[PDB]
Design a protein around this ligand. Structure first.
Ligand SMILES: *[B]([O])([O])[C][N]C(=O)C1=C([C])ON=C1C1=C(Cl)[C]=[C][C]=[C]1
Length: 263
């Protein structure tokens, strides 16, 4: 609805930065509304969902096991590893790392999983392989969050990310068991409370993954809908603002409030 674009542009004005947006019909893949849909923005942690998608793709093909245990050490720990830093002794399984990476956005977990699939180069090849010729992961945590202006490294576009998530969650790319595991990790997301979830009406479904980076970077990707089932995909990114984390969170929440109001 056009009223939501009013809020998105209001958001660019208040944040003094670019805001990218897109609302996608989950079933048909039709773009319902957009703002800078094909402009690049850092992915920050929203990439962790694509990372686990590639991991599940491997499991389905027998190249990986969810119960497989990964051992790591202090040397591996990078900034913001609330779950992995507590398991140095016995390690964690592939399954537990994706849980950590998606629900808590644990950075070391991401790094460990990336290592299992062959690094950024491979995640990028996986994406290209599934029709996404835009999204690219080039670095590891934490450098991929640098958000250098005009830098194409570690970026995606609102349209590219929305189309790719739709495929991950409804395509024949993953088995049904794998698709549900991914959605289950996104539905349990525990660090995105002040964003879209704060505007979600009672009874609605939402599976999401947020992101934060340098230079005011903030974003979120999500599948949501009424009566406990998702029916649309929403992707929101911004970068360049000098606004506080709280102000950035609110603008996203308000964009959310509008898209829900005009559903
Ligand atoms: B991802 O969520 O974009 C990566 N986030 C971080 O690496 C991070 C850091 C370095 O310090 N806090 C976070 C973080 C934020 Cl700002 C929000 C939610 C989870 C982690």
């Amino acid at each position: 609805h056009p009223e939501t674009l009013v809020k998105v542009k209001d958001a660019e004005d208040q944040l003094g930065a670019r805001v990218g947006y897109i609302e996608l019909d989950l079933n048909s893949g039709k773009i319902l509304e957009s703002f800078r849909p094909e402009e690049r923005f850092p992915m920050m942690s929203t990439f962790k969902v694509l990372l686990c998608g590639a991991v599940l793709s491997r499991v389905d093909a027998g190249q990986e096991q969810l119960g497989r245990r990964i051992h790591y050490s202090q040397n591996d720990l990078v900034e913001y590893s609330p779950v992995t830093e507590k398991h140095l002794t016995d390690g964690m399984t592939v399954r537990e790392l994706c849980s950590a990476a998606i629900t808590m956005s644990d950075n070391t977990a991401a790094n460990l999983l990336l290592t299992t699939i062959g690094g950024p180069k491979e995640l990028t090849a996986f994406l290209h392989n599934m029709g996404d010729h835009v999204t690219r992961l080039d670095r590891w945590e934490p450098e991929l969050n640098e958000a250098i202006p005009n830098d194409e490294r570690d970026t995606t576009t609102p349209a590219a990310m929305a189309t790719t998530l739709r495929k991950l969650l409804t395509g024949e790319l993953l088995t049904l068991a794998s698709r549900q595991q991914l959605i289950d990790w996104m539905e349990a997301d525990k660090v995105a409370g002040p964003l879209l979830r704060s505007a979600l009406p009672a009874g609605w479904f939402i599976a999401d993954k947020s992101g934060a980076g340098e230079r005011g970077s903030r974003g979120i990707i999500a599948a949501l809908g009424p009566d406990g089932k998702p029916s649309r995909i929403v992707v929101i990114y911004t970068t360049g603002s000098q606004a506080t984390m709280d102000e950035r969170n609110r603008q996203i929440a308000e964009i959310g409030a509008s898209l829900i109001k005009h559903w």
